[PDB]
Design a protein around this ligand. Sequence first.
Ligand SMILES: *[C@@H]1O[C@H](CO)[C@@H](O[C@@H]2O[C@H](CO)[C@@H](O[C@@H]3O[C@H](CO[C@H]4O[C@H](CO[C@H]5O[C@H](CO)[C@@H](O)[C@H](O)[C@@H]5O)[C@@H](O)[C@H](O[C@H]5O[C@H](CO)[C@@H](O)[C@H](O)[C@@H]5O)[C@@H]4O)[C@@H](O)[C@H](O[C@H]4O[C@H](CO)[C@@H](O)[C@H](O)[C@@H]4O[C@H]4O[C@H](CO)[C@@H](O)[C@H](O)[C@@H]4O[C@H]4O[C@H](CO)[C@@H](O)[C@H](O)[C@@H]4O)[C@@H]3O)[C@H](O)[C@H]2NC(C)=O)[C@H](O)[C@H]1NC(C)=O
Ligand SMILES: *[C@@H]1O[C@H](CO)[C@@H](O[C@@H]2O[C@H](CO)[C@@H](O[C@@H]3O[C@H](CO[C@H]4O[C@H](CO[C@H]5O[C@H](CO)[C@@H](O)[C@H](O)[C@@H]5O)[C@@H](O)[C@H](O[C@H]5O[C@H](CO)[C@@H](O)[C@H](O)[C@@H]5O)[C@@H]4O)[C@@H](O)[C@H](O[C@H]4O[C@H](CO)[C@@H](O)[C@H](O)[C@@H]4O[C@H]4O[C@H](CO)[C@@H](O)[C@H](O)[C@@H]4O[C@H]4O[C@H](CO)[C@@H](O)[C@H](O)[C@@H]4O)[C@@H]3O)[C@H](O)[C@H]2NC(C)=O)[C@H](O)[C@H]1NC(C)=O
Ligand SMILES: *[C@@H]1O[C@H](CO)[C@@H](O[C@@H]2O[C@H](CO)[C@@H](O[C@@H]3O[C@H](CO[C@H]4O[C@H](CO[C@H]5O[C@H](CO)[C@@H](O)[C@H](O)[C@@H]5O)[C@@H](O)[C@H](O[C@H]5O[C@H](CO)[C@@H](O)[C@H](O)[C@@H]5O)[C@@H]4O)[C@@H](O)[C@H](O[C@H]4O[C@H](CO)[C@@H](O)[C@H](O)[C@@H]4O[C@H]4O[C@H](CO)[C@@H](O)[C@H](O)[C@@H]4O[C@H]4O[C@H](CO)[C@@H](O)[C@H](O)[C@@H]4O)[C@@H]3O)[C@H](O)[C@H]2NC(C)=O)[C@H](O)[C@H]1NC(C)=O
Ligand SMILES: *[C@@H]1O[C@H](CO)[C@@H](O[C@@H]2O[C@H](CO)[C@@H](O[C@@H]3O[C@H](CO[C@H]4O[C@H](CO[C@H]5O[C@H](CO)[C@@H](O)[C@H](O)[C@@H]5O)[C@@H](O)[C@H](O[C@H]5O[C@H](CO)[C@@H](O)[C@H](O)[C@@H]5O)[C@@H]4O)[C@@H](O)[C@H](O[C@H]4O[C@H](CO)[C@@H](O)[C@H](O)[C@@H]4O[C@H]4O[C@H](CO)[C@@H](O)[C@H](O)[C@@H]4O[C@H]4O[C@H](CO)[C@@H](O)[C@H](O)[C@@H]4O)[C@@H]3O)[C@H](O)[C@H]2NC(C)=O)[C@H](O)[C@H]1NC(C)=O
Ligand SMILES: CO[C@@H]([C@@H]1OC(C(=O)O)=C[C@H](NC(=N)N)[C@H]1NC(C)=O)[C@H](O)CO
Ligand SMILES: CO[C@@H]([C@@H]1OC(C(=O)O)=C[C@H](NC(=N)N)[C@H]1NC(C)=O)[C@H](O)CO
Ligand SMILES: CO[C@@H]([C@@H]1OC(C(=O)O)=C[C@H](NC(=N)N)[C@H]1NC(C)=O)[C@H](O)CO
Ligand SMILES: [Ca+2]
Ligand SMILES: [Ca+2]
Ligand SMILES: [Ca+2]
Ligand SMILES: [Ca+2]
Lengths: 388, 388, 388, 388
Amino acid sequence: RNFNNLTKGLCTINSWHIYGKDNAVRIGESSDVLVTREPYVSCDPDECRFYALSQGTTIRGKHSNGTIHDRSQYRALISWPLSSPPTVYNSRVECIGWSSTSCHDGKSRMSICISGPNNNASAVVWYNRRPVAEINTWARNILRTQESECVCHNGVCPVVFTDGSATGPADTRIYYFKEGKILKWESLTGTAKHIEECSCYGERTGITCTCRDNWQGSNRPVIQIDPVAMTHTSQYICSPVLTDNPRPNDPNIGKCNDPYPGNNNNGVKGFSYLDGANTWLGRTISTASRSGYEMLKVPNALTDDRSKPIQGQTIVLNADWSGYSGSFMDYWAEGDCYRACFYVELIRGRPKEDKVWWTSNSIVSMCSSTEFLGQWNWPDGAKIEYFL
Amino acid sequence: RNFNNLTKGLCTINSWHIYGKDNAVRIGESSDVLVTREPYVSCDPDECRFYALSQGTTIRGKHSNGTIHDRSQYRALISWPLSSPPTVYNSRVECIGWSSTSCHDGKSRMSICISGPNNNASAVVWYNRRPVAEINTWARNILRTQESECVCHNGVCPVVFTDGSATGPADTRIYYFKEGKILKWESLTGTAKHIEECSCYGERTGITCTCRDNWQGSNRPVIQIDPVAMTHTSQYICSPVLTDNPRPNDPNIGKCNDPYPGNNNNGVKGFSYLDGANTWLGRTISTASRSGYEMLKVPNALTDDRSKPIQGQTIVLNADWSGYSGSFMDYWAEGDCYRACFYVELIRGRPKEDKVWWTSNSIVSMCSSTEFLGQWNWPDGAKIEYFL
Amino acid sequence: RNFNNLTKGLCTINSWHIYGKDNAVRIGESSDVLVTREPYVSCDPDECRFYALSQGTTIRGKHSNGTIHDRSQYRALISWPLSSPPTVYNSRVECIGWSSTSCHDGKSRMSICISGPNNNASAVVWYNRRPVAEINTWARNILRTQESECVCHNGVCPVVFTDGSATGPADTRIYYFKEGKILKWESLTGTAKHIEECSCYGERTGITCTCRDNWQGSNRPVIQIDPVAMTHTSQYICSPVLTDNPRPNDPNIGKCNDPYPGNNNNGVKGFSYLDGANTWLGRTISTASRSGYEMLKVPNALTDDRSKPIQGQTIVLNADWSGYSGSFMDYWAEGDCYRACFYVELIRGRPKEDKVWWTSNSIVSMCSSTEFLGQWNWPDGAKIEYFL
Amino acid sequence: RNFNNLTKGLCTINSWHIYGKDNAVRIGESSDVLVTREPYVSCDPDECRFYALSQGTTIRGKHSNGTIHDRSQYRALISWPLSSPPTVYNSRVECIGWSSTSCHDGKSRMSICISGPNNNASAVVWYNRRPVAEINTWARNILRTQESECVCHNGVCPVVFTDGSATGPADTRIYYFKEGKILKWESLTGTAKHIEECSCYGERTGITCTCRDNWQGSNRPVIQIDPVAMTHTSQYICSPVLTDNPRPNDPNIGKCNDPYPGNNNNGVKGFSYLDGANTWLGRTISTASRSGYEMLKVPNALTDDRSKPIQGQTIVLNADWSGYSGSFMDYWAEGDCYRACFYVELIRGRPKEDKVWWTSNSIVSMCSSTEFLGQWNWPDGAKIEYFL
Ligand SMILES: *[C@@H]1O[C@H](CO)[C@@H](O[C@@H]2O[C@H](CO)[C@@H](O[C@@H]3O[C@H](CO[C@H]4O[C@H](CO[C@H]5O[C@H](CO)[C@@H](O)[C@H](O)[C@@H]5O)[C@@H](O)[C@H](O[C@H]5O[C@H](CO)[C@@H](O)[C@H](O)[C@@H]5O)[C@@H]4O)[C@@H](O)[C@H](O[C@H]4O[C@H](CO)[C@@H](O)[C@H](O)[C@@H]4O[C@H]4O[C@H](CO)[C@@H](O)[C@H](O)[C@@H]4O[C@H]4O[C@H](CO)[C@@H](O)[C@H](O)[C@@H]4O)[C@@H]3O)[C@H](O)[C@H]2NC(C)=O)[C@H](O)[C@H]1NC(C)=O
Ligand SMILES: *[C@@H]1O[C@H](CO)[C@@H](O[C@@H]2O[C@H](CO)[C@@H](O[C@@H]3O[C@H](CO[C@H]4O[C@H](CO[C@H]5O[C@H](CO)[C@@H](O)[C@H](O)[C@@H]5O)[C@@H](O)[C@H](O[C@H]5O[C@H](CO)[C@@H](O)[C@H](O)[C@@H]5O)[C@@H]4O)[C@@H](O)[C@H](O[C@H]4O[C@H](CO)[C@@H](O)[C@H](O)[C@@H]4O[C@H]4O[C@H](CO)[C@@H](O)[C@H](O)[C@@H]4O[C@H]4O[C@H](CO)[C@@H](O)[C@H](O)[C@@H]4O)[C@@H]3O)[C@H](O)[C@H]2NC(C)=O)[C@H](O)[C@H]1NC(C)=O
Ligand SMILES: *[C@@H]1O[C@H](CO)[C@@H](O[C@@H]2O[C@H](CO)[C@@H](O[C@@H]3O[C@H](CO[C@H]4O[C@H](CO[C@H]5O[C@H](CO)[C@@H](O)[C@H](O)[C@@H]5O)[C@@H](O)[C@H](O[C@H]5O[C@H](CO)[C@@H](O)[C@H](O)[C@@H]5O)[C@@H]4O)[C@@H](O)[C@H](O[C@H]4O[C@H](CO)[C@@H](O)[C@H](O)[C@@H]4O[C@H]4O[C@H](CO)[C@@H](O)[C@H](O)[C@@H]4O[C@H]4O[C@H](CO)[C@@H](O)[C@H](O)[C@@H]4O)[C@@H]3O)[C@H](O)[C@H]2NC(C)=O)[C@H](O)[C@H]1NC(C)=O
Ligand SMILES: *[C@@H]1O[C@H](CO)[C@@H](O[C@@H]2O[C@H](CO)[C@@H](O[C@@H]3O[C@H](CO[C@H]4O[C@H](CO[C@H]5O[C@H](CO)[C@@H](O)[C@H](O)[C@@H]5O)[C@@H](O)[C@H](O[C@H]5O[C@H](CO)[C@@H](O)[C@H](O)[C@@H]5O)[C@@H]4O)[C@@H](O)[C@H](O[C@H]4O[C@H](CO)[C@@H](O)[C@H](O)[C@@H]4O[C@H]4O[C@H](CO)[C@@H](O)[C@H](O)[C@@H]4O[C@H]4O[C@H](CO)[C@@H](O)[C@H](O)[C@@H]4O)[C@@H]3O)[C@H](O)[C@H]2NC(C)=O)[C@H](O)[C@H]1NC(C)=O
Ligand SMILES: CO[C@@H]([C@@H]1OC(C(=O)O)=C[C@H](NC(=N)N)[C@H]1NC(C)=O)[C@H](O)CO
Ligand SMILES: CO[C@@H]([C@@H]1OC(C(=O)O)=C[C@H](NC(=N)N)[C@H]1NC(C)=O)[C@H](O)CO
Ligand SMILES: CO[C@@H]([C@@H]1OC(C(=O)O)=C[C@H](NC(=N)N)[C@H]1NC(C)=O)[C@H](O)CO
Ligand SMILES: [Ca+2]
Ligand SMILES: [Ca+2]
Ligand SMILES: [Ca+2]
Ligand SMILES: [Ca+2]
């Protein structure tokens, strides 16, 4: 009935507890589970759901062959009940395309899907399950967006888009929507030099997005958005605890206003919670590939170029495949604070496991606890040999 | 709570954006997807859904053999959630039969299904999911109707029916229903010489239907209906941009009041939006077969027998199979105007692909944008070889 | 909110129109469709649904072997959406057992299921999805009930039960329930000599049940129930148009107060609408087996021992298998009268088709029209060879 | 809207009637049924549902291999509609983990799931489908809980947990939750010497839990909880009718305040209804293995160390496999009393049936009747050979 306002701070994060896990690849070995990738989680006022980009085929289906490909006409943003797998029979299509974001403003949900060829892509903005606005490519080079939830304040939902090179300067815009309509957009400002796939969360201070620099940087760029003034700034996480993948080894001095060098033209979507002494960063354990996942408590990581971990938690062992990760919170939960949450995409199949011809994933998700909880590890759990 | 009134004009159509796509044949290669044909889309005040005539078997099921056939006892009008495929487990049966139409009046939905042998068919009119009225065949020769949504104004929902020859003069009637009851019917008047499978939409001016002349014409007949007076007129689209299939090549002078000659005893269901300078016509790209699909902006196509395109958009490449197409709009969307939408049936299997023994389809659907959006193309996407 | 009252007469029946059909055996050849038998249809104030006794296995499942058997621990009353098939994923279990009835009183639904061994069976009465009352066997010989819907008036829902011999005198009781509680029961009175599987409907005059005499009669017994006084009478349909199966050929004089002789120890569940000159009887076409189905207009069939047909309609050809049939009506439909409806069970498999090891069925259902509609025929439609 | 209060006594139990049965293993031979174990039943004010711990694979899926294992990362508490089987498409995930309980307080449902390695497990407490509180292991040895429903009074829901040895003294705590928050916890007091897997029910006197002593006892420990004062006591069922499995033969004197000896380091979850002369105990028929199930009326079993049966009912024949059993009631049913109910887990597969590589179960459930109903027996019904 009313637009949600960001009126709370983050809860104190002392550990992470299991929130959701769908075991989609295990189950999909023998049931009609859709091939997906680029998953996320997003809450409505009365329900939280899993989201992902379908590939328009099941895993056991013959059309799973070739699903390493990123952008076909057979992709769509789907949602399904928390911790169920994405099945043909339980998945709700939000919009058609191969790059997405979605968020609820307290009244209704906005979902955005981009489709088209590389040089002529377009975004369609849906609100309350109807198409409301459209945005054409401005740089004619793979218009693309967050691949995780956006965040709203008093009806205003900012979204970060990029159009242009994946290996050099590109044209990033921040759009501000209300009820699906474009209030305003602005070109990226600040010191971030390349922006992709922002993972965002909101709290009383404003909206914070942790993104992927695909060009030169292995530190992560950050965009901080004021959804009331509809303005933003950008920089990088200052910490020498580097969180992109692949990436160099951790130095003792990070970079606040420029890419930390060593790995070019690659990256992975990731996230962080930047909150002074309550700061936690996510990253793959491997510096070379999308394997393992850990959380590290790094005080003042955003602003302190010498900051190091003082606590951590393993989420996925280095022996197990990970992938994309992103932030979300249940803005409609009871209490005095917003509980930080995240998901990790657990990619199976190609390119790392090429005895099968498909690429898909499952999801694991955690939220923060004020307790100091014991840790487990959370693999996808499927045996590739079963699919041969 | 209240009957919908047609109080708005069409939004300005400057391009078309992706609205829905179910990838039904791809998914049905390995899941329980019903064989269908003659699909459409129709909105309720709170949801839009896909519709089609099931064949009462799945694609992988052995009973898919022989589904090129049009009129069996195993067919039914089904509906299912937007962009999901029509599965055994998610499809809702609206009524039983092999020719249909359906529309919501703002309070409840009317669905009409025709069944029976060729010489003794009958229509059953359902309203709010209950049978309310029945109409017996009047010419004893395949009583048949729109195969896409009807349109309502202040509770009155006109529907076009034909009974009689597919290859000569037939008996077409326009029925006017309210809450499923027959208010009135009238015989076709005007200059259209053969009428089948009308695709309709409504706006403040009245209801406009673009139909199929199966006898002599390769231009499309148009019926214009006043749902208040409950009267109609008919003619053909005057434009030399011919939109039936198969069809002759485009001349420079069309025909307003008679069939444009060249192809007899054949046709395909199609649609148009006739709105002065905002006029757009749909057609297959091929003049010979149901392949490809394009939209063409043809100013005053209804009334100008010299009118030619000034803009266009490819929807499906000529290399890919298409099929039926029809109009629908979300009459319950926010805003100052009604956004034109359409679907294209993408037929797979027989007769064109006879290495399989079945005939089915998937759906792609677009709505108009006031932006000039880049275009993609939207194939069914299934590989026939996988079904062998 | 309020209990339904039977305040209307039957609509004039001039023909029958298609209402529902699930094609369950066709679809179940390749999808997870439950094996069933003894189906029926019953309406809530907001929805009508199919009902049947599951066998606790799918058709393609190996446990379908042996499903000719009537009474296992794996049976349950299930319901599912109108004209969908009964699938593992869409079927709602109403109660556990191998003989059932169910009806909505305007506020909530009562469902009754009998389970147990032959000598120790018991009925459990559910109301608003909770068990409320239980009834133990009184004759210790296969306690059994209607296998189609009951009917309610002002909260009172009468149900006919039989316990005792299938081949001689048995102990039949009429129970009167309200909100699942037993108000009263009475022993059968009148001239009916054996009662099984009553098919009932209600109108302003009271409740009329047409049953099966399994002992000596090939005419059908009738029980007429006053749900206000909670009393009943019984006799047989007087008409020489005999409607049990198997049965002798039609004579010119029927029997009002005794079994018409010729076939012993057998029968089939059936139904009729007894309404003076608006009387219609259902029967199998074959006199020997459960094949074919037809409706016959037989004026005053209940009371006139010379009555013959003056009109009819074929529903299922004699070449096709039929089975059980029963009555139901949508008591919550709009209008001045109740529209008579019925279903026919289309049995496939054993004993008639013994190349498969299972027994199941599909459903076809019709309702009456005041029009004189053309007739089709409605086979199950499955090819047995596909299951081999 | 209001918290449920325990204001009624138990209905008089004179026999047991069939309540639910899902036939999950039969159906799962050919449909997408999840492998489960540790099932139970629990009611909301408007619905009752089946619950269990999924293994994150279907039975026919290759990942069913190894599902005898108790604690993997692929387990979750799921719920699904009463008497349906737990399918991929109909199961709702309540939380992630390998030990659970769940209960509705009249306003919303609390669900608790424990996950983690043996030495670092943690409980997450969910309320109204959101995580609210977390509890870390206190003895670092397989933190574990009830595996059946908890019970609430005026918002307070007590839950019994154990952490520590399965073969010697352990650390049992009773937690008191309200809206998912921890009001209080206390260490176990009284004479019970080992506590696992409590089965609880509530009535006006308070909450009664019947548990499993896995250390030395083959009588069952009982915890009696006052949810208002938030205090408890414990002892054993005094009766010589012993109800653990495996167990010694029944003596003539039981033990009230110590384990009855004979079988060490083993047990099974079970239940009882302790209500003076209305007392009924459940147990496996076999003293050696989890086979058969019976109910026995044993007056004053809780307090009388000489008490013997005066009536009984067989639920599952000794020839058929059983397993876990537990209590639940529909606290929201109409009437003057609470109707006692229970479920029995019917385990199939390993270790007893090792020709298959999986372990799963189906469910049968009964509630009490004031009638003296005839008894049947209720096997799982699946043929193991079909899975080979
Ligand atoms: C039951 O569950 C519980 C809860 O989960 C388990 O307890 C958890 O155990 C884990 C594993 O040990 C802990 O995670 C690690 O945390 C440490 C940080 O804590 C340590 O350091 C703190 C800071 O110390 C500094 O300040 C203090 C101030 O006093 C000073 O004294 C000290 O000398 C130093 O100056 C200490 O405060 C802290 O002590 C506290 O906690 C102790 C328990 O942990 C306790 O005993 C003490 O009493 C006190 O209370 C503690 O010493 C993280 O550093 C560590 O993360 C590093 O290591 C992991 C591998 O294990 C690696 O994956 C990480 O990426 C990271 O190391 C990489 O990055 C570093 C930063 O750049 C770099 O320096 C490293 O060389 C390394 O870099 C290399 O690898 C990376 C990744 O591949 C690559 O990118 C680089 O390029 C390079 O190749 C862990 O996160 C939890 O904190 C702990 N939780 C709790 C609540 O205790 C418990 O074990 C379980 N029980 C059982 C029986 O299993
Ligand atoms: C990114 O995406 C964007 C957006 O989608 C892409 O841009 C789109 O590009 C497509 C493809 O080119 C365009 O579709 C075509 O549109 C033309 C109409 O526009 C042209 O003509 C207009 C009218 O010109 C007349 O009036 C002007 C007045 O000034 C006069 O000067 C002129 O000489 C003439 O008298 C022009 O106004 C218009 O110019 C404007 O737009 C230009 C860009 O398009 C721009 O550069 C200009 O500055 C200006 O703004 C333009 O010249 C349609 O005619 C055409 O449709 C025909 O051709 C296709 C094949 O491509 C065919 O399938 C169609 O059926 C049709 O041709 C058949 O029918 C004709 C009519 O009877 C007949 O004459 C033809 O011979 C042909 O008939 C044959 O085939 C059919 C079918 O099989 C058969 O039935 C017949 O029997 C026979 O065999 C296209 O629809 C879009 O309009 C355009 N959109 C936008 C917004 O720009 C962009 O390309 C993408 N970018 C990249 C890098 O990929
Ligand atoms: C398009 O669809 C429409 C609508 O469906 C189709 O029209 C329908 O056509 C069917 C098939 O013909 C009709 O069903 C039959 O109806 C007759 C009853 O109607 C006839 O008899 C009436 C009574 O006549 C008596 O009174 C009059 C008073 O004037 C008197 O004059 C007359 O001599 C006699 O005394 C007539 O009133 C009626 O005429 C009216 O209707 C005519 C059209 O039908 C029309 O032309 C007239 O102008 C007038 O308006 C008409 O003559 C039923 O008798 C018949 O049912 C019997 O036959 C079928 C086989 O076809 C059988 O299965 C039935 O069981 C039954 O016969 C068995 O039972 C009898 C009773 O005991 C017994 O006597 C028989 O020997 C037989 O018994 C044997 O078989 C059974 C079963 O196996 C076994 O149990 C026994 O033991 C024994 O072995 C049909 O139901 C529809 O009524 C008709 N509908 C309409 C609205 O017209 C149309 O055909 C379709 N169009 C096309 C092109 O396909
Ligand atoms: C249709 O359905 C109906 C309803 O279901 C069926 O009727 C049911 O039939 C069953 C099966 O017979 C009954 O269950 C049994 O109940 C008896 C208890 O009732 C008997 O005993 C009562 C107490 O007697 C004492 O007090 C009286 C006071 O007057 C005194 O006179 C008497 O001498 C004695 O001192 C009697 O009151 C009662 O009589 C009443 O009911 C009669 C009908 O049952 C009726 O005829 C009378 O007129 C009167 O009304 C009756 O005699 C339970 O004892 C029994 O349970 C034991 O046996 C089963 C095996 O059958 C076993 O599984 C149980 O575990 C248990 O036996 C074990 O435990 C004992 C206790 O420690 C031990 O002593 C045993 O040696 C044995 O222990 C061994 O095995 C266990 C398990 O493996 C192992 O753990 C041990 O270590 C050891 O190895 C049954 O539960 C129902 O009560 C009855 N229901 C009704 C309402 O009638 C009907 O049959 C069906 N019809 C048809 C045709 O099929
Ligand atoms: C082209 O690669 C971009 C995205 O790369 C990732 C990945 O796994 O690394 C998959 C995304 N796939 C989808 N969202 N479908 C790509 N993003 C797109 C739009 O292809 C990358 O960020 C460089 O610009
Ligand atoms: C035993 O046969 C009775 C019922 O027979 C019919 C049938 O196909 O003829 C199936 C029913 N099957 C089920 N309802 N499950 C039986 N009725 C029962 C209770 O077995 C018959 O009416 C004689 O008493
Ligand atoms: C370790 O065994 C415990 C539980 O044992 C049972 C069983 O079938 O006997 C399965 C449970 N499995 C699950 N709940 N998943 C176990 N409980 C646990 C936590 O493993 C036992 O009570 C001893 O402590
Ligand atoms: Ca990078
Ligand atoms: Ca034509
Ligand atoms: Ca008989
Ligand atoms: Ca024990």
